[PDB]
A paper describes a structure:
In plant cells, ALMTs are key plasma and vacuolar membrane-localized anion channels regulating plant responses to the environment. Among the different ion transporters and ion channels localized in the vacuolar membrane, the ion channels of the aluminum-activated malate transporter (ALMT) family play a key role for the transport of chloride and malate during stomata opening/closure. ALMTs are also involved in transporting various anion including chloride, nitrate, fumarate, tartrate, citrate, and malate. Here we report the cryo-EM structures of [name] from [name] ([name]), a malate-activated vacuolar anion channel, in plugged and unplugged lipid-bound states.
From the [name]-supplemented dataset 1 with no malate and dataset 2 with 10 mM malate, we unequivocally identified [name] densities in the lateral fenestrations and phospholipid (PL) densities in the pore (hereinafter called as “pore lipid”) in two classes. The only difference observed between the datasets 1 and 2 was the presence of a malate density in the pore of the dataset 2. In the [name]-supplemented datasets 1 and 2, we identified two distinct classes in the sterol mimic-bound state: “sterol 1” when one pore lipid tail of the sterol mimic ([name]) is in the fenestrations and “sterol 2” when two pore lipid tails of the sterol mimic ([name]) are in the fenestrations. Unexpectedly, we observed that the succinate head group of [name] interacted with several residues. Since the succinate group was the key structural moiety to differentiate [name] from native cholesterols, these interactions were likely to present artificial features and to inhibit pore lipid expulsion (described later). Similarly, the succinate head group of [name] in the lower fenestrations occupied the S3 region interacting with W120, Y208, and R226. These observations indicate that phosphate groups of PL and the dicarboxylic moieties (malate and succinate head group of [name]) compete with each other for malate binding sites S0, S1, and S3. The sterol mimic-bound and pore lipid-bound classes represent plugged states in which the pore is blocked by the head groups of one or two pore lipids. Additionally, the TMD of the sterol mimic-bound classes is similar with those of the pore lipid-bound and peripheral lipid-bound classes, suggesting that plant sterols may contribute to the regulation of the clade 2 ALMTs.
Residue numbers in the entry:
A (entry chain B), B (entry chain A): 77 to 278, 298 to 435, 527 to 571
Write the structure that this text describes.
Amino acid sequence: AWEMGVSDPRKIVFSAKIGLALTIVALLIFYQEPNPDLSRYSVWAILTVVVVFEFTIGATLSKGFNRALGTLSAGGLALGMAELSTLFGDWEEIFCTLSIFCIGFLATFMKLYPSMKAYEYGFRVFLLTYCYILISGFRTGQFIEVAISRFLLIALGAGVSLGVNMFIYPIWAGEDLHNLVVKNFMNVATSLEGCVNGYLRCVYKGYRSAVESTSQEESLMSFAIWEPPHGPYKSFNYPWKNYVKLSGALKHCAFTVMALHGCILSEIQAPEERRQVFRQELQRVGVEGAKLLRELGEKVKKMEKLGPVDLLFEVHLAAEELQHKIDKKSYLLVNSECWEKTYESASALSLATFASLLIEFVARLQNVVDAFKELSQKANFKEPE
Amino acid sequence: AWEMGVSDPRKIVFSAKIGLALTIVALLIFYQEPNPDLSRYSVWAILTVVVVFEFTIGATLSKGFNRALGTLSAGGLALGMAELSTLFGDWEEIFCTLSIFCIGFLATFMKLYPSMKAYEYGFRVFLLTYCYILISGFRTGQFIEVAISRFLLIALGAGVSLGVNMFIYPIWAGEDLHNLVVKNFMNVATSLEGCVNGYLRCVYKGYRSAVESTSQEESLMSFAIWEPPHGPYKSFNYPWKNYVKLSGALKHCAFTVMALHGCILSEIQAPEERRQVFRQELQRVGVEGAKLLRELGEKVKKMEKLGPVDLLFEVHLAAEELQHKIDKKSYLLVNSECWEKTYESASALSLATFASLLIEFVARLQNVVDAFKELSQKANFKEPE
Ligand SMILES: CCCCCCCCCCCCCCCCCC(=O)OC[C@H](COP(=O)(O)O)OC(=O)CCCCCCCCCCCCCCCCC
Ligand SMILES: CC(C)CCC[C@@H](C)[C@H]1CC[C@H]2[C@@H]3CC=C4C[C@@H](OC(=O)CCC(=O)O)CC[C@]4(C)[C@H]3CC[C@]12C
Ligand SMILES: CC(C)CCC[C@@H](C)[C@H]1CC[C@H]2[C@@H]3CC=C4C[C@@H](OC(=O)CCC(=O)O)CC[C@]4(C)[C@H]3CC[C@]12C
């Protein structure tokens, strides 16, 4: 309630816009001279403002196109089918009912298509429009006449909804993917630091969102291609795919962070004393990785280019130091007496796993800087301050 | 198309049932004596059969209840608000429009609630019903009269849709979670075998579905609690939660299989010659794990109890043999000259990671047999043949 409103004020603005549109339409309908058909068809303009408003502007311009195509096709097909059914006599009702049967069967079958999963609304609109335009009219000429009135009412409703949506505090879909990309870096860095600290002690939301939020960026990219230039994004063809590429490159490391976190919840764990021998190198590598990830995130937020100095010098050095430390004290991981209990060796061998996973992270942190450079070049960025 | 139909014939039956219901309703409406209001309100029975049909029976009995509650509450609130607005004079329209504003604002705000995410249809039905019942009627007594007719038509449509749905080849939601649980075991076993073979060579769908399909079982469990006894499930309170518990227990191992698969796609990999020294033990452990998983899956499919002999004897032995083999030849994983290049040791240390992950799998395969025993006891099973 109040906590939700204070946390995010965009929802309040959305609700206010919906209320304002509904109030405008209701006032326009009410303050009209009485008409015989002004009380029977005036409810068609208030049911169109509640079925056209969407959060983002791209989600409002991309779904309206489909919904239209569907409505127009269904209306045309229904009119043609009625005109063809008038051909025969004394048997029209049977043809109409068999047309309803075939149409419903085909609509349901095509709506159950794996690939066509997010377009259910279009098929349902098609089916409903066909049924209504045939049953309600029960005639060809009689119906076509009232189509004019019903289209004017539905277009008044859709025009008022579009006007109000695209003019009072618009919410663009291109400014959401950017914030998601920026937040992913911080989440991954926090998860890495938490995992390292938890292991060296006497971490889920970050990588969970980094991995799970893989289908929530494709939708935003699909919505953002319908919007016009607005502010910093000064172009008609903005490379919105490079953001998805960078997000996938970061998810690749997020998988390794997931594995590191899973290491903690294992049933076979090494003794604390052995863990407390590689503390400094592990903590240094963790801090350097987190710092580099946060630096990349901040650079993405401000839309700036990478400077001259390399960013992975300290991570690439801390990895070498950790490797050397593991090499020196590598007799605590594997016993040497039996060379040519099981639980003891199983618990002692987990530190090599942890070190190898950390090294894999540090060896997978370069694809995200290649992706960042590609993005910073495709979408013209500002030179570093 | 034809491939979809041959792969799954349930969709064809669903489409046929939808078509049959629509045809019955259309014939009933058409073959009726002409009435002044039989052509203006007869389209309200064909728009209710297309908005009430759902795949499963539980999904049809669980959503209808909410949709009803919402419709009834909205109608009552609208009637009360109209009766209260009649109190004043010459200013009713303003009160009605401010009621529309407040109702729309509250509806949108409560529909944007994180927790209330899957109940959007109920809120939209509430809002649409309120707006229609106020604007269309523009009166209290006049509207209440026609409510009888509109309710009879909507109940004829919903009754024909429910009859047709629950009598001609029903599709129960309790027979889908069972098949998902059975399929998960086979998928995980196949993924494990594929990963092992790929590593020992000169694997994604299984664990992906095991992990990803975590929210598709809660929905089935929620739908299955509305259905009555049918066939083998002879009880009014069936333990549908134990299936989810078993699925989560299997997902726990699926995470380790995910880590094993990720090991293959790493940038630092051990030499093939060193890999070819532990081939037999790894292959034996993989085969035993796959066989045990398939045995548990088959036992779940047939609804049978675990016999006397233990199931993890051979896995628990192959793990010991692998541990001994790693102990004997443990000088190929860590160098001994530097005791007190980096890439060489980094690549050589990955075999310990692979072995440790395999041992973790074999040490996490017991929670799934505890969960299976608990399920086999809570839901009375048949004694083994
Ligand atoms: C040449 C080209 C010609 C072009 C031809 C153009 C054709 C124009 C076609 C016009 C028709 C198109 C209509 C489409 C509009 C969308 C409609 C729609 O989809 O539905 C939304 C929606 C669609 O499904 P959704 O997207 O999942 O929400 O369905 C509904 O929600 C409507 C549900 C109907 C229930 C309304 C009940 C209100 C009255 C209840 C009274 C109960 C009183 C009880 C009292 C109790 C207390 C005593
Ligand atoms: C006539 C051609 C040359 C231009 C198009 C003019 C209108 C006839 C179009 C523009 C927007 C269309 C509307 C777009 C959105 C909707 C809401 C749509 O709602 C749903 O799809 C149900 C909700 C859901 O599925 O989530 C019902 C049809 C309708 C009113 C469409 C009817 C046809 C409209 C008014
Ligand atoms: C009156 C009390 C004592 C018993 C209930 C009798 C009827 C008035 C109930 C039973 C089923 C209800 C219907 C259940 C399902 C729907 C479809 C529903 O569709 C949607 O919610 C839109 C689609 C979607 O959101 O996915 C619109 C209202 C309606 C017809 C409901 C209106 C009220 C109905 C007819």
